Design a binder for these strands. Structure first.
Ligand SMILES: Nc1ccn([C@H]2C[C@H](O)[C@@H](COP(=O)(O)OP(=O)(O)OP(=O)(O)O)O2)c(=O)n1
Ligand SMILES: [Ca+2]
Ligand SMILES: [Ca+2]
Length: 341
DNA sequence: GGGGGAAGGACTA
DNA sequence: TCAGTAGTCCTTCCCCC
């Protein structure tokens, strides 16, 4: 198999640059303003001029401003990036019917039946980059290898605005030399459990007793890592279908007062129903983020679709279940719909 | 023994 | 006054065949 992975460069910030070119060359920071106070919230992403200085996705907006007080701070306009993303995905469909859209800014193409070798895949990759640049003026990074995991890794190594092929020989070198923390799906917590087992490279998972590996990181991740280490990882490129749609909002102030929380919960339901658009969910979950940032949730599944009115009344019962079963105050409240008809 | 669901947890956004 | 904001898949514990 030959997989071609496309990951758009600093996506949210780049789309803003495309819509307002005077922004180019300046540090741009796209933010999610929570509304609790002046500048409360987090950075969604920043272009490379801002990232060079430590302003990156996830940090508080107040911290970003301490580092770069004169950078351009823009409010996230998700719907705008979504429309731009959808047009780029449509361009990629022209290069392969076998495409897997993994997120708002990334897709995997199985080009096995389109090119004969890596030389040709690499060329098709250039063709793709040029096409996206021509049509939307957006630069992307392309990663090419024998499977999804290594195609993604290839891209990670070449961004931004890059293109890289990890051939079979390099795949073998990487299995031995690549820091296992850099493997998709290995976060800080798993990375720490592995370091604690002596495991720092994929190749290391082949010599550890399987039960020891599994007992520590679970059966699924152990098999995943082993399959990659044996160079036998095979997952087909598959059309993704959204399985849930939801919205969670931050409250002006923490609380466990039902009438005070209702307005935020109802606003989350409205926005959520706006996004479902024709999709009818049979399940609804109320999700609360507690004062200490823990996540607690309660849901219900119906043998039929959930009308907006039913979503309103059931969400309150589920919220009450959360209040009655957890004594912490709530900071964020939202809903999540799933099991679509 | 293991299918199947609810809720927590990890990961990547 | 650090802490957003969406969404997926796996795990653990429980019911049930
Ligand atoms: N914690 C995060 C991480 C990402 N995103 C959003 C904004 C990013 O623009 C977009 C894509 O994610 P990437 O990790 O690919 O980040 P970028 O495209 O921004 O940059 P790059 O790919 O250059 O590294 O997803 C977000 O809202 N919150
Ligand atoms: Ca990406
Ligand atoms: Ca990207």
């Amino acid at each position: 198999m030959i997989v071609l992975f496309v990951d758009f460069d600093y996506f949210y910030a780049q789309v803003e640059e495309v819509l307002n070119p005077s922004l180019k060359g300046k540090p741009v920071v796209v933010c999610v303003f929570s509304g609790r106070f002046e500048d409360s919230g987090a950075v969604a992403t920043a272009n490379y001029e801002a990232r060079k200085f430590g302003v990156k996705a996830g940090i508080p907006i107040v911290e970003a401003k301490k580092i770069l007080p004169n950078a351009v701070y823009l409010p996230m306009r998700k719907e705008v990036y979504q429309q731009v993303s959808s047009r780029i995905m449509n361009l990629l469909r022209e290069y392969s019917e076998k495409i897997e859209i993994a997120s708002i800014d990334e897709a995997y193409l199985d080009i096995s039946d389109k090119v004969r070798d890596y030389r040709e895949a690499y060329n098709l990759g250039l063709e793709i980059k040029n096409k996206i640049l021509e049509k939307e003026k957006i630069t992307v990074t392309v990663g090419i290898s024998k499977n999804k995991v290594f195609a993604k890794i290839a891209a990670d190594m070449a961004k931004p605005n890059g293109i890289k092929v990890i051939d079979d020989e390099e795949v073998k070198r990487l299995i031995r030399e690549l820091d296992i923390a850099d493997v998709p799906g290995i976060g800080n917590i798993t990375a720490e459990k592995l370091k604690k087992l002596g495991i720092n490279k994929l190749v290391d998972t082949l010599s550890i007793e399987f039960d020891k590996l599994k007992g520590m990181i679970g059966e699924a991740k152990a098999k995943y890592l082993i399959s990659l280490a044996r160079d036998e990882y095979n997952e087909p490129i598959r059309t993704r279908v959204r399985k849930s749609i939801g919205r969670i909002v931050t409250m002006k102030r923490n609380s466990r007062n039902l009438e005070e929380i209702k307005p935020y919960l109802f606003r989350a339901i409205e926005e959520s129903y706006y996004k479902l658009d024709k999709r009818i969910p049979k399940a609804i979950h109320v999700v609360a983020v507690t004062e200490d940032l823990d996540i607690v949730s309660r849901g219900r599944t119906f043998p039929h679709g959930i009308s907006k009115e039913t979503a309103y009344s059931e969400s309150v019962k589920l919220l009450q279940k959360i209040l009655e079963e957890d004594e912490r105050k709530i900071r964020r409240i939202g809903v999540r719909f799933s099991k679509f008809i």
